[PDB]
């Protein structure tokens, strides 16, 4: 393996002492080689206990090194002091960067010394600069200095990659060495006593700078990383938006030669149309003012790149312009104070001189859309609106509530804020009213939360009480169903692939058509959202209170009206210093259940009005209006060909007419491409944002290092597929430090390639990128059962809370409200849902995961001896694999590439077998009980509970079905027709299609039903054993791509799988689960 070779040179770099030793640990599937592994590991612990070498021992036990596989590498290091600064002065050659002070409009966001920015010790909030990743700066500088000594002696091409990653390191190292490397605590939080003399934003600058200089490959990358590393030391605020500004304009200049398209039922076609790009002179005057704001900010090598591209305006050099936009978001987050983020957001200027003739049409268009979404589930009395108190409470999001409450659960009292834990307390103390929702007014205001965006100003968010979730769950779950059957709302075009969903932009683009994409400056706190948006919905629930006749569908529709009356005036609770500031804010509340289902109504019903007022001058015929919250486009098809004046006079008539409703906007029109989400259609080729901060998190999580090392790799493979190539030798160096564990003092344990890359709970990174590899060899399926044996752990906090008198009083009050019977297969099935729902609490899931890893250390310091006969996914593929016969085969390049930023070893698969044409849905069949229970009751049972029901008596299935609420003639038509007997073979087959994934980070892009992959896969057909047929044609279609990515060549399989081995595998596929299947092997 390649990763093990990077391990044994990382140890020889960080521990350059003669007192240091490395002890490899080995394991094997053989019972004979295991005793070869026990004796070898014992002797290296006795010989290295008292100063004896290992070169005389590795020859004697060379029967175990070349045959068994590496488990871990133990590290002895009697080094008292970290030698980071001792080898930092070797690279600290350049002049130190002096910070600037006149570049920011605030004081704390400037780059001042922390002694001058915070006067005393007690008012030191690190939450403006905190990287909140579980690594350090001292560990990052060892990850670059390891790379800068391995690639010192290089060939004449790879030297220039090393040289450009060195002059960008002397900018970093000569600034850090001037103030010294900061020393963190054990929680990876930079304290005040170390940051007394260091400049503020030195950790989050040098973390965002090291992420950049491990991505500098070409000279086009070096001019960007030289003018962003120097500048991000000075202005932390304006820099991320000045560079990322013209990419909203530059998407409208490129021509269309041959573009993709998606037809009406969402499937992919290819089109060949040639559409000119028509931009007026007021775009090249708005682009020159976007290139003079980048010259006053100091940077001068970026607008020379753009102005050398504006004379071309060609799609061949647009991968350079998408690279400049993506490097802008890597400067780090824009975190600021909670007071200045709200008070700059909650400040808005309303005006009584707004056009009231346009609001009474905008209110009515919200009225006629809310009625249109609920006219069918209210006229027919639906099973989910009649149970709004229960379906909102039984499926309750457990993220957070407003305040911190002292919850007492039996003996163990806990300070929690989770939302379903507040429901358990108030249902125990009786202070929980089902039909009364609390008023958010000048008394009891709304608390606040924040979300940080890598380039945007820090925004606020609203945390409503839990009684504003039970009132709004059942109605808005009926509005998301209509948003998946309408061509306008963007819950419809939401699939796995991105060419299918955002490819209806280029359906109506021609030379007589004009696309129109507008982004409101702030969708919250607009004038058209305070009064005319609530009173359009309250009117829609007056016409819906006349549609039905129940006392219970009206009552849930008089609660969803009461939450809009109470939010017409609102107050936010934000503290500062010692005073609490209550700010009136009657606008929309980003943070309800309603905040996306009613940002697609209020923005469609707004743009259906502003497209009506511009039709007094230009007569057109609109084709689609797709809307996604704020971000919406609307294609307009004209009579004449679109010229340079119809583009200018529509962009002046959509901007001004939006200003007639006091909504400040910029209105951009083009004919070639838009920027709807961060996914950019440019010239018929979808381009992505590609900015994910590796070494900077927006907030500290509920996860450990072994899980934050997986999201460092998962944020890299998304960064690589989207066009931002970070060096794999740096990501692998950063996994060998995060997965480090200190057993005792001066002893670190490092797992090998087989512990991290195997398919289990403890997975960090794949061996070769973009592909999953299920290792079918006997030394690798044997360790998968060793890791699948300890994943089932119990946490003592979740079992002290599950046996309390409060949690049992919540399940028994929820089981009594649901079922009007006695049965305990639901009370034992509801209580297993809220025990699973309490994993969102932080010390519960941390004591789950720490009991996973601390039990892994007992497995890694010794050779593994755990032998078990469990059927895994990796045991199915050991029986299929010897019956494949490979043969080399040639396959031409037919289809066109649609994403130019993809890597070369992925783009060659797309050019040969094609991008995905349609989203494959092969999930078998749902059982006939779950179509009978989910249609009457709102209780969705797990499929391991519906198998437990079927294996009961005939008279105990009928008692269970009548228990939920099913009538007697419907259960007796179920049970009497013996279709409970057929559902044994549809539950057990539902775990086969769940098993293997045709979607991944990379596998979504390809077409798996292509007529060029079906030509290479040559498998003979057997009529029976249907479960085996699926897993043969899926594993064969995955084995060719997993070979054609690694080596760039195509192979053609042949699986003459015999009839005697299919029936042995048919019972292996039905015995993965832990339930009684009728057909077993032995």
């Amino acid at each position: 393996g390649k990763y093990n070779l990077i391990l044994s040179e990382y140890l020889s770099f960080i521990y350059n002492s003669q007192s240091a030793v490395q002890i490899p640990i080995y394991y094997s599937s053989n019972s004979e080689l295991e005793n070869r592994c026990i004796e070898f590991h014992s002797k290296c612990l006795e010989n290295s206990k008292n100063g004896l070498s290992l070169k005389k021992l590795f020859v004697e036990y060379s029967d175990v090194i070349e045959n068994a596989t590496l488990l871990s590498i133990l590290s002895y290091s009697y080094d008292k002091y970290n030698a980071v600064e001792r080898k930092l002065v070797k690279y600290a050659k350049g002049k130190p960067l002096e910070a600037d002070l006149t570049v920011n409009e605030l004081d704390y966001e400037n780059n001042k010394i922390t002694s001058e920015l915070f006067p005393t010790a007690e008012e030191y909030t690190d939450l403006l600069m905190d990287p909140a990743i579980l690594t350090s700066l001292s560990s990052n500088l060892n990850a670059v200095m390891f790379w800068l000594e391995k690639h010192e002696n290089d060939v004449a091409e790879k030297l220039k990659i090393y040289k450009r990653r060195l002059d960008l390191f002397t900018i970093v190292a000569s600034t850090v060495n001037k103030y010294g490397v900061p020393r963190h605590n054990a929680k990876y939080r930079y304290e005040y006593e170390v940051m007394k003399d260091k400049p503020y934003y030195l950790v989050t600058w040098a973390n965002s700078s090291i992420e950049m200089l491990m991505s500098v490959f070409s000279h086009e990358d070096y001019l960007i990383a030289r003018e962003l590393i120097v500048l991000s030391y000075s202005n932390r605020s304006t820099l991320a938006k000045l560079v990322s500004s013209p990419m909203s304009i530059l998407v409208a200049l490129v021509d269309i030669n041959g573009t993709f398209i998606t037809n009406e039922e969402l499937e992919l076609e290819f089109s060949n149309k040639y559409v000119r790009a028509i931009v007026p002179d007021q775009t090249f005057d708005e682009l020159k003012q976007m290139l003079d704001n980048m010259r006053k900010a100091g940077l001068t090598d970026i607008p020379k790149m753009i102005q050398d591209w504006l004379v071309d305006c060609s799609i061949e050099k647009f991968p350079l312009m998408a690279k400049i936009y993506s490097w802008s978001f890597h400067v780090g987050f824009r975190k600021q104070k909670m007071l200045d983020a709200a008070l700059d957001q909650l400040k808005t200027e309303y005006t009584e001189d707004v056009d009231d003739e346009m609001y009474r049409e905008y209110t009515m268009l919200i009225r006629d859309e809310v009625v249109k979404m609920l006219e069918e589930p209210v006229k027919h009395d639906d099973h989910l609106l009649q149970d709004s108190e229960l379906a909102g409470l039984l499926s309750m999001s457990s993220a957070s509530n407003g305040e911190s409450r002292q919850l007492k659960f039996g003996r163990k009292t806990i300070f929690s804020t989770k939302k379903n834990m507040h429901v358990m307390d108030d249902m125990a103390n009786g202070r929980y009213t089902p039909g009364i929702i609390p008023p958010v007014n000048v008394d009891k205001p709304i608390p606040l939360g924040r979300r940080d965006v890598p380039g945007r100003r820090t925004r606020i968010i609203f945390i409503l009480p839990y009684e504003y979730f039970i009132a709004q769950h059942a109605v808005v779950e009926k509005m998301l169903i209509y948003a998946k059957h309408t061509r306008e709302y963007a819950e419809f075009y939401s699939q796995s692939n991105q060419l299918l969903s955002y490819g209806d932009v280029t359906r109506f683009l021609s030379n007589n058509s004009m696309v129109l994409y507008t982004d409101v400056s702030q969708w919250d706190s607009s004038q058209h959202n305070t009064q005319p948006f609530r009173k359009g919905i309250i009117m829609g629930l007056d016409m819906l209170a006349n549609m039905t006749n129940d006392a219970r569908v009206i009552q849930t529709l008089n609660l969803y009206k009461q939450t809009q009356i109470n939010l017409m005036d609102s107050y936010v609770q934000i503290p500062d210093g010692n005073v609490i500031k209550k700010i009136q804010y009657g606008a929309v509340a980003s943070g309800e259940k309603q905040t996306k289902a009613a940002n697609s109504i209020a923005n469609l019903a707004l743009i259906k009005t502003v497209l009506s007022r511009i039709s007094n001058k230009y007569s057109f015929a609109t084709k689609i209006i797709r809307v996604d919250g704020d971000d919406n486009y609307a294609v307009l098809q004209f009579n004449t060909e679109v010229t340079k004046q119809m583009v200018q006079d529509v962009s002046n008539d959509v901007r001004e007419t939006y200003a007639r409703m006091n909504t400040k906007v910029k209105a951009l029109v083009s004919t070639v491409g838009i920027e709807i989400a961060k996914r950019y259609i440019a010239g018929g080729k979808i381009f992505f944002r590609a900015g994910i901060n590796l070494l900077n998190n927006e907030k500290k999580g509920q996860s450990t290092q072994w899980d934050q090392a997986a999201v460092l790799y998962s944020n890299y493979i998304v960064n690589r597929l989207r066009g931002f190539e970070t060096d794999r030798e740096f990501i692998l160096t950063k996994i060998m430090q995060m997965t480090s564990v200190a057993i005792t003092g001066s002893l670190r344990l490092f797992p090998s390639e087989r512990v991290l890359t195997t398919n289990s709970t403890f997975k960090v990174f794949d061996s070769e990128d973009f592909i999953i590899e299920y290792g079918t060899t006997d030394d690798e399926v044997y360790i998968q059962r060793a890791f699948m044996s300890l994943s089932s752990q119990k946490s003592g906090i979740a079992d002290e809370i599950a046996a309390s008198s409060t949690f049992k009083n919540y399940v028994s009050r929820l089981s009594e409200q649901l079922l009007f019977s006695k049965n305990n297969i639901v009370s034992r099935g509801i209580a297993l849902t809220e025990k699973a729902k309490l994993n969102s609490y932080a010390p519960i899931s941390l004591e789950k995961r720490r009991a996973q890893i601390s039990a892994l250390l007992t497995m890694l310091q010794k050779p593994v001896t755990f032998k078990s006969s469990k059927i895994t996914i990796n045991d199915i593929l050991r029986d299929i694999k010897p019956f494949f016969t490979v043969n080399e085969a040639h396959l031409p390049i037919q289809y066109q590439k649609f994403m130019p930023t993809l890597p070369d070893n992925v783009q060659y698969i797309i050019q040969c077998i094609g991008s995905r044409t349609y989203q494959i849905e092969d999930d078998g069949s749902k059982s006939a009980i779950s179509r009978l229970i989910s249609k009457y009751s709102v209780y969705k049972p797990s499929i391991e509970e519906l198998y437990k029901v079927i294996s009961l008596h005939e008279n105990e299935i009928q008692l269970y079905l009548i228990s939920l609420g099913i009538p007697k003639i419907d259960a007796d038509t179920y049970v009497g027709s013996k279709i409970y007997s057929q559902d044994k073979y549809r539950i057990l087959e539902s775990y086969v299609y769940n098993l293997l994934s045709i979607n991944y980070g990379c596998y979504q892009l390809f077409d798996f039903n292509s007529p060029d992959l079906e030509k290479l896969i040559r498998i003979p057909f057997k009529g029976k054993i249907p479960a085996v047929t699926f897993i043969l044609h899926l594993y064969a279609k995955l084995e060719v791509i997993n070979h054609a990515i690694k080596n760039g060549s195509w192979i053609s399989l042949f699986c003459n799988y015999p009839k005697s081995e299919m029936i042995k595998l048919w019972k292996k596929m039905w015995n993965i689960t832990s339930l009684r299947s009728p057909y077993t092997n032995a």
Binding site: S8, V21, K55, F58
Partner: peptide, 13 residues
């Protein structure tokens, strides 16, 4: 000294 690592690195290689 570091003579042990060049004999231990090529064990893995």
């Amino acid at each position: 000294n570091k003579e042990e690592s060049k004999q231990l690195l090529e064990v893995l290689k």
